[PDB]
Amino acid sequence: SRKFIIANARVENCAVIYCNDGFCELCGYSRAEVMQRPCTCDFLHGPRTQRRAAAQIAQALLGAEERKVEIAFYRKDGSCFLCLVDVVPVKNEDGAVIMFILNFEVVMEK
């Protein structure tokens, strides 16, 4: 099951403007909760979440850079999962970034 969100690159906090069912089911947060949150998805952060990984994802968004970052995330129920976050900038003809697609894959459980 694919898990992904789409972020608005033209607002300061890169707000989530779409999230698919797979993503919501993965992390245990409903679409209503996820929508309009910064697409870094800090609400998934917990004890094992590496500062360096979080920083690297944030960097990719700032610099509109395509990048895969593997990071420990937490579902609503507290379970930890190692997640490969795939940051994909989508630019127009001019070269401006219009949105980001972020894909999430579970690497392994806990």
PDB file of C-alpha atoms in Angstrom, residues 31-88:
ATOM      1  CA  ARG A  31      -6.838  12.828   7.448  1.00  0.00           C
ATOM      2  CA  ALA A  32      -8.553  15.549   9.499  1.00  0.00           C
ATOM      3  CA  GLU A  33      -5.582  15.593  11.892  1.00  0.00           C
ATOM      4  CA  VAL A  34      -2.875  15.485   9.241  1.00  0.00           C
ATOM      5  CA  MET A  35      -4.237  18.130   6.863  1.00  0.00           C
ATOM      6  CA  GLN A  36      -2.564  21.554   7.093  1.00  0.00           C
ATOM      7  CA  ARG A  37       0.231  20.356   9.416  1.00  0.00           C
ATOM      8  CA  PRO A  38       3.829  21.065   8.384  1.00  0.00           C
ATOM      9  CA  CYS A  39       4.825  18.200   6.070  1.00  0.00           C
ATOM     10  CA  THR A  40       7.827  17.356   8.257  1.00  0.00           C
ATOM     11  CA  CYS A  41       5.173  15.497  10.256  1.00  0.00           C
ATOM     12  CA  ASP A  42       6.766  16.357  13.615  1.00  0.00           C
ATOM     13  CA  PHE A  43       3.741  14.764  15.290  1.00  0.00           C
ATOM     14  CA  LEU A  44       5.404  11.463  14.337  1.00  0.00           C
ATOM     15  CA  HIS A  45       8.592  12.274  16.256  1.00  0.00           C
ATOM     16  CA  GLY A  46       9.543  10.446  19.437  1.00  0.00           C
ATOM     17  CA  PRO A  47      12.482   9.281  21.589  1.00  0.00           C
ATOM     18  CA  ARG A  48      14.468   7.496  18.839  1.00  0.00           C
ATOM     19  CA  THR A  49      13.889  10.210  16.222  1.00  0.00           C
ATOM     20  CA  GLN A  50      17.365  11.328  15.135  1.00  0.00           C
ATOM     21  CA  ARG A  51      17.957  15.094  15.124  1.00  0.00           C
ATOM     22  CA  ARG A  52      20.196  14.575  12.088  1.00  0.00           C
ATOM     23  CA  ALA A  53      17.499  12.748  10.100  1.00  0.00           C
ATOM     24  CA  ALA A  54      14.844  15.338  10.957  1.00  0.00           C
ATOM     25  CA  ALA A  55      17.293  18.084   9.991  1.00  0.00           C
ATOM     26  CA  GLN A  56      18.060  16.343   6.699  1.00  0.00           C
ATOM     27  CA  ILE A  57      14.382  16.108   5.752  1.00  0.00           C
ATOM     28  CA  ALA A  58      13.872  19.758   6.669  1.00  0.00           C
ATOM     29  CA  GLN A  59      16.906  20.688   4.568  1.00  0.00           C
ATOM     30  CA  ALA A  60      15.518  18.880   1.523  1.00  0.00           C
ATOM     31  CA  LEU A  61      12.352  20.960   1.774  1.00  0.00           C
ATOM     32  CA  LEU A  62      14.205  24.244   2.240  1.00  0.00           C
ATOM     33  CA  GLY A  63      16.530  23.638  -0.686  1.00  0.00           C
ATOM     34  CA  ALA A  64      13.906  21.944  -2.842  1.00  0.00           C
ATOM     35  CA  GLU A  65      16.195  18.934  -3.064  1.00  0.00           C
ATOM     36  CA  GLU A  66      15.152  15.401  -3.939  1.00  0.00           C
ATOM     37  CA  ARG A  67      16.262  13.214  -1.051  1.00  0.00           C
ATOM     38  CA  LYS A  68      15.610   9.979   0.803  1.00  0.00           C
ATOM     39  CA  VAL A  69      15.999  10.060   4.576  1.00  0.00           C
ATOM     40  CA  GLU A  70      15.495   7.126   6.914  1.00  0.00           C
ATOM     41  CA  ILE A  71      14.089   8.142  10.279  1.00  0.00           C
ATOM     42  CA  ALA A  72      12.365   6.623  13.302  1.00  0.00           C
ATOM     43  CA  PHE A  73       8.707   7.639  13.566  1.00  0.00           C
ATOM     44  CA  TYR A  74       5.873   6.897  15.984  1.00  0.00           C
ATOM     45  CA  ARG A  75       2.258   5.940  15.318  1.00  0.00           C
ATOM     46  CA  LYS A  76      -0.554   7.444  17.374  1.00  0.00           C
ATOM     47  CA  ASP A  77      -0.543   4.303  19.536  1.00  0.00           C
ATOM     48  CA  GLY A  78       3.121   4.821  20.418  1.00  0.00           C
ATOM     49  CA  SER A  79       4.589   2.043  18.279  1.00  0.00           C
ATOM     50  CA  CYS A  80       7.898   2.935  16.641  1.00  0.00           C
ATOM     51  CA  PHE A  81       8.698   2.304  13.003  1.00  0.00           C
ATOM     52  CA  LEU A  82      11.833   3.032  11.019  1.00  0.00           C
ATOM     53  CA  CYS A  83      10.666   4.979   7.993  1.00  0.00           C
ATOM     54  CA  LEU A  84      12.264   5.840   4.669  1.00  0.00           C
ATOM     55  CA  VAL A  85      11.015   9.308   3.782  1.00  0.00           C
ATOM     56  CA  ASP A  86      11.276  10.150   0.107  1.00  0.00           C
ATOM     57  CA  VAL A  87      11.103  13.914  -0.501  1.00  0.00           C
ATOM     58  CA  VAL A  88      10.136  14.759  -4.064  1.00  0.00           C
TER      59      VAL A  88
END
